[PDB]
């Protein structure tokens with residue numbers, strides 16, 4: 424493999440990646456996200472979690488099948504780290520995919536936060552989630568490519584005109600602004 428090793432330096436990243444804004448993070452395309460959802464790597468990937476970091480009204484307006492909505496740090500930390508999600512075979516991997524609407528701000532920040540906490544609770548260089556990617560372009564670019572891999576089949580943007588109050592109500596729940 425032509426890249427560096429995953430976070431615990433155990434092995435190479437499994438998936439092909441594409442260039443994204445944060446040059447030190449690993450991004451995948453919608454097609455690679457579908458390869459995980461179709462079991463293309465089922466012999467190796469035991470579990471994968473898609474963490475949709477958008478606000479609840481965005482997720483309810485249309486999200487990728489199987490994704491979990493964890494927009495607040497405290498909730499992403501509890502869900503992912505209180506009782507870590509591990510493969511049922513040591514030969515197999517667990518992979519996290521983070522995304523938001525454009526995968527520009529929200530997704531990358533949550534990914535970095537979970538890596539920080541993962542480092543904090545382990546003895547270096549061990550990690551519960553050594554392999555984490557960002558979905559390039561976020562739900563905004565995934566829906567137009569694979570609508571049948573979404574539920575419900577629609578897209579509600581963060582800045583949607585009818586949800587301005589819901590945006591503010593959510594922001595007042597965050598740990599910091």
Ligand SMILES: [Cl-]
Pocket residue numbers: 494495496497596597598599
């Ligand atoms: Cl938060």
